[PDB]
């Protein structure tokens, strides 16, 4: 039993036939990543059953913009001049590729932050990573290799 | 105002110590190639001994914002220039372990533990603490050295 | 005694293939860590966001040709909690006793 | 000369080659074939030879034992990113 | 390398085909 854990591959060619070309892309990701767990899909199934500061920075163009309204509706803790979301998954993109996050937004007149996971998506692959996790990486690697070097100082 | 102040508070601090460990290694690497002559066993310990020291400060610099950075966990979005030539992005944003993780298992399995859970594990902790307390005994003996 | 301890401290050896292969080991096994400390210098370009950041960035010639300031993060102080509070984290501290033990064996 | 082998013939020949320890080694320490689950899945499919009437065709009995080992190992074997089988990295 | 590669049939052993197998075996029941 071996895990792929801290993001690895895609799901590829299988919704390449179903076709990836933005907007549909997000749903293709859902099958692929094995990472739609609650809200976005839940919204999907219920129907299937029968701005923000970052959003202002983002600005949504086409049908995914319509979905966005739906998602807010699904997940909005409400305060006087503010709304906060539970488990929505969403995206930011360009041309060949994009990046998407699954997040929680806290709002106010002069500031608003979404805490989430962010995932980049190029050519049927997802990236989800952490600095500090990122460092431990080639850092411990550098040192194990330096200690190979130090072990080689077994020279007279 | 369009885009965001993402992260990287102590990132500068990591970079500095990331560099010094790079800088001390790199220089040893350059010499390492003139295997025509090794620099004087004094010289190499001066460079490889402060080169290891460099990674202690670089080791610790990681923990000091250690709550902050694994929490920050930024994955890249960029110019699509990053998308051409591809891999560089996979490579440059990737955390792993090398063939390294393996002697990490050799070591983990070298301990006396693995799947026996919580109650027996908490006990082992108290026992290791007792070993550290028997290590205080070193304090007593050091007084004798006097 | 001092002369002989100084002899052992002269690196000195007359080895053919024996002496040869060993020093090649140093070259490659040291070089690896040198090169991986360069991934460490690439996290430097990863800052971007500042002029002093660009300075650190030019560290790669490929950064010299990969203009962007590229990356961004959010908040999982919760995930910091998970790193620290997990039963996995308690357990991982056992990997600390384990490697340390084998280090003591060495 | 004989015509090209049948699938049944190809698989019988192949399962039996696993009776050779060196060859099984040369595979275990391949790269590509462990990237994708295909080969792993193939070897489990080949356990069809372990029962009658199939097994009655096996001349090299060790290959069945080695297949079984090889198989059980794989389930818990950790696959490195390149293809390297993790639990074997120390050996040649 | 006088050591042969695994049989060409290996390419068919994808996890997608494995999932489709149980239903296929059924339908079949109805070189």
């Amino acid at each position: 039993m071996n895990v792929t854990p801290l993001d690895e591959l895609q799901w590829k060619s299988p919704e390449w036939i179903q076709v990836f070309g933005l907007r549909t892309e997000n749903v293709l990701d859902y099958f692929a990543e094995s990472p739609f767990f609650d809200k976005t899909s839940n919204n999907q199934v219920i129907k299937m059953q029968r701005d923000p500061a970052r959003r202002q920075i983002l600005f949504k163009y086409p049908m995914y913009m319509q979905l966005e309204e739906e998602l807010m509706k699904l997940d909005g803790t409400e305060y006087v001049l503010s709304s906060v979301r539970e488990p929505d998954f969403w995206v930011i993109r360009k041309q060949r590729r994009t990046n998407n996050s699954g997040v929680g937004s806290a709002k106010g007149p002069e500031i608003i932050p979404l805490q989430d996971y962010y995932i980049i998506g190029a050519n049927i692959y997802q990236s989800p990573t952490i600095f500090k996790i990122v460092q431990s990486r080639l850092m411990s690697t550098s040192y194990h290799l330096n200690s190979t070097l130090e072990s080689l100082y077994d020279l007279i | 105002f369009d885009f965001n102040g993402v992260p990287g508070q102590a990132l500068d601090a990591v970079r500095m110590r990331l560099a010094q460990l790079t800088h001390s290694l790199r220089r040893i690497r350059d010499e390492m190639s003139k295997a025509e002559l090794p620099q004087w066993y004094t010289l190499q310990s001066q460079l490889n001994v402060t080169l290891s020291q460099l990674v202690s400060v670089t080791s610790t610099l990681q923990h000091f914002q250690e709550t902050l950075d694994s929490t920050v966990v930024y994955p890249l979005p960029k110019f699509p220039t990053t998308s051409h030539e591809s891999l560089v992005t996979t490579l440059l944003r990737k955390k792993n372990i090398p063939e390294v993780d393996e002697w990490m298992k050799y070591v983990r399995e070298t301990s006396g533990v693995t799947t026996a859970l919580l109650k027996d594990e908490e006990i082992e902790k108290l026992l290791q603490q007792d070993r550290e307390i028997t290590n205080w005994a070193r304090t007593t003996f050091r007084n004798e050295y006097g | 005694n001092e002369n002989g301890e100084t002899d052992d401290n002269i690196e000195t050896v007359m080895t053919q293939e024996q002496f040869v292969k060993r020093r090649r080991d140093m070259l490659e096994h040291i070089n690896l860590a040198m090169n991986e400390s360069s991934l460490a210098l690439e996290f430097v370009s990863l800052l971007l966001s500042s002029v002093k950041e660009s300075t650190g960035m030019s560290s790669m010639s490929p950064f010299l040709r990969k203009v962007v300031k590229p990356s961004s993060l959010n908040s999982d102080k919760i995930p910091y909690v998970a790193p620290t509070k997990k039963e996995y984290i308690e357990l991982d501290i056992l990997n600390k006793g384990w490697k340390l033990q084998s280090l003591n064996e060495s | 000369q004989n015509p090209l082998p049948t699938r049944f013939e190809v698989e019988l020949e192949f399962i039996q080659s696993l009776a050779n320890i060196q060859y099984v080694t040369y595979l275990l320490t391949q790269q590509q074939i462990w990237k994708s689950p295909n080969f792993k899945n193939y070897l489990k499919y080949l356990e069809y030879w372990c029962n009658p009437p199939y097994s009655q065709c096996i001349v090299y009995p060790n290959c069945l034992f080695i297949l079984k080992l090889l198989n059980g190992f794989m389930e818990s074997a950790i696959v490195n990113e390149d293809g390297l089988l993790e639990g074997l990295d120390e050996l040649p | 390398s006088l050591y042969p590669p695994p049989p060409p049939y290996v390419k068919f052993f994808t996890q997608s085909n494995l999932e489709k197998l149980p239903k296929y075996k059924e339908k079949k029941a109805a070189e």
């Binding site: 591959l9 590829k12 692929a32 | 560099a19 996979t90 990737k94 | 790669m60 | 696959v79 990113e81 | 997608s16």
Partner: peptide, 25 residues
Amino acid sequence: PSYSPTSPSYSPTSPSYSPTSPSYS
């Protein structure tokens, strides 16, 4: 001013950091 310029080495031919297991549909 740590040294002068910054030491290139950039590498995609290294051991490897990616695995692979979700290839199947």
